[PDB]
Amino acid sequence: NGIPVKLLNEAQGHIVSLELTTGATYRGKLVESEDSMNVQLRDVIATEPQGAVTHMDQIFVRGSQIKFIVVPDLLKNAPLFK
Amino acid sequence: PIELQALKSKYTNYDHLIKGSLKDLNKRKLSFKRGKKFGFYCDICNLTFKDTLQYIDHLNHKVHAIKFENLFDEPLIIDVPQEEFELCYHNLIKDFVEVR
Amino acid sequence: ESNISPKQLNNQSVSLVIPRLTRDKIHNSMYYKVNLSNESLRGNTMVELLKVMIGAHLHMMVIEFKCILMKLIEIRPNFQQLNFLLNVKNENGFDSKYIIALLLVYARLQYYYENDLIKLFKVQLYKYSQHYFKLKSFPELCIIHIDELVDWLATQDHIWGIPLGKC
């Protein structure tokens, strides 16, 4: 498995932000992250490239469609320094 | 990191730390700071001591223990609600048989 | 203040059990400064103090015994813990090997007459004196039987340089 996959699994239960290949940003609490980067998310606030913002309850996006994630700074401590 | 935890595991157990004398009587060709390249190595404060009583006595001193704690944590300062000798002592018999 | 001289055990002090000369021989000895006291035991710790002695043909001969006994004194653990450490772990035979006379001479120094429990400890040490055990001791070299060292010890005034009182 990937070390960043391992971190991303640690990120479960936290509030993360996600940018997809389309460019829409989903901020919310990450329920579940599979090995394939498929992520289940809660109470998501979404900002579109046009600037419009919406709210949704439960969202699940495919791994392949995710440009990148931003995860909280708490995890930066360890154990990935090694 | 993990190597620092191994260094910890070293400066904790003395039985292995006791012997830096393995050379016994031997000739070695070449202000206590950053090591003398010889003598007894204290990496915590970065001092090397030419005699044993200074090396161990300094270790028994508070300052060396203060630095040893400031490296990571304070186990050196760390009741007996009978679980200490029951569980810990039973672990002494168990580990003793494991080594034997 | 001479040495630590703290606490309890017969209303005066704990370290008074051992003479000044031998006590300062130990506190000035290498073994005490290395493997014992606060930096080695993370403060006073009886179970880790036992980790030292248990960690020590066997190399340890009954200096190191004087020192480990002295730290047993200065720490002064519970008589209950003495009971457990004495009577537990019957599933292994290498555990109490040199701990026998250690926990023995310890209580031999402690008190002279909790009282009934101490007497039960003594009569149990008599049973172990009947247990027919053999051990070696050094200062010269003398191997002695547990029956001779326990009875000769309780009946004898001085033991390896430390005097004893009559219980």
Add this chain to the structure above:
Amino acid sequence: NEWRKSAIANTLLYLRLKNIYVSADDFVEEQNVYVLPKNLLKKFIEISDVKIQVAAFIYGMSAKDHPKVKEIKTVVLVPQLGHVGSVQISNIPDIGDLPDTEGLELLGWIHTQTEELKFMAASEVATHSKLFADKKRDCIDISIFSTPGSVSLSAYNLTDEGYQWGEENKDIMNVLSEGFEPTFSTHAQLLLSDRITGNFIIPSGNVWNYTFMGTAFNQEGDYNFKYGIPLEFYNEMHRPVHFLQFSELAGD
């Protein structure tokens, strides 16, 4: 003492064969006589030490010209730990596996010393008996006296009483050596020739001298053997402890 002075002294050992003489005993066909080549002897002298006793076994067979003549073809150098005037030696070698051994009989053994004797000493006789006790009674010994400028070949035999003496008396036993005498020993017939030559067998590890390897030597223990060139008594292979001590002198 130690390695330095004797090892440096070892280079001069080729000079000891420029002059070679023996007190010439009467030649007798009644008992078997030995023919020893000049090269094997020289190589053994080179490998040997000025002080410490070096000793190997020697093998050969009877030629068809005279069955009473024994030609020494094969020297067999064996695991040993030597002292001054004494040596510890392993068992009789099992060399059947090697080629060029078609019934090579056990003729005896050879050793070095510095004292001129007409008899075999206690440390030698006891060792002889321990090697050959129940195995071969009539095997012989070659005692090479060595001193700067010349060497001397003193051959010896042994009777049945000496074996008993060695069986009973192994460690120390100086008085029973004094009583034992040189009487048991009988001067065996040995010759030195350039008309034949021979070869060496050596252990598989190629370290025959266990002087400074004290743990590895075993007085009764099995070893594989091979043909090869033997090393010097003080040689780099025989002195490994010195390199760890040499680099350990500066340390790290």
Add this chain to the structure above:
Amino acid sequence: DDARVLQTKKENMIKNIDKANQVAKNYEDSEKERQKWFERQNERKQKHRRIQLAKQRESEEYEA
């Protein structure tokens, strides 16, 4: 088979020298006890009998 035996005895030689090398690195009844406490207890009763005999001599001195 012979080659395997050579490799084996070689392995045992190496291992034995290894244990020996480790050793070098490290270097770098009951009836007699019961009867013994019987004679010792007899010595204790003999000492108490000696003290009682001394008190008897003192009682005779007081009577005299």
Add this chain to the structure above:
Amino acid sequence: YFSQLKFEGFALNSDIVFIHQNAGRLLRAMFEICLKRGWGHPTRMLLNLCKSATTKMWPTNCPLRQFKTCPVEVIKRLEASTVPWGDYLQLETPAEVGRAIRSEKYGKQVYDLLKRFPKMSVTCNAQPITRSVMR
């Protein structure tokens, strides 16, 4: 230099630099000369010396040192184990090598490297062509 000694006082270290650059040269020359002469005692020892100048080690230091990938603890253990080199080379089973080198770790690596160390089963049959010439 053969034993790998760097020094504090650098006068000696400068001289040993000179010996570093020209030593394998001179030794190799001596070896070739003896080889032309046809002398047996010097040529083998000189060849060992040349090898020692090239690879910077002794015979009593194990040849596993000149592998780039072989670790330090292992080579120390073999140096201190007092064992003939032929035995280690004859050992085949990897687990058995790890047991022989008394560290369970790295044993497989060591055996791989052994099969990467030169090992020759060599035979020779001489035979005369005529009385003087021998093939």
Add this chain to the structure above:
RNA sequence: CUCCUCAUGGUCAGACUAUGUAGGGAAUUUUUGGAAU
């Protein structure tokens, strides 16, 4: 050079780590393109 697979030697109660004459890193979530304008 890296990741996986496999093999392996070890350790722990499948995982981890060194090595390998090993297999591999084009068919949906990554490295053989849905990009181009």
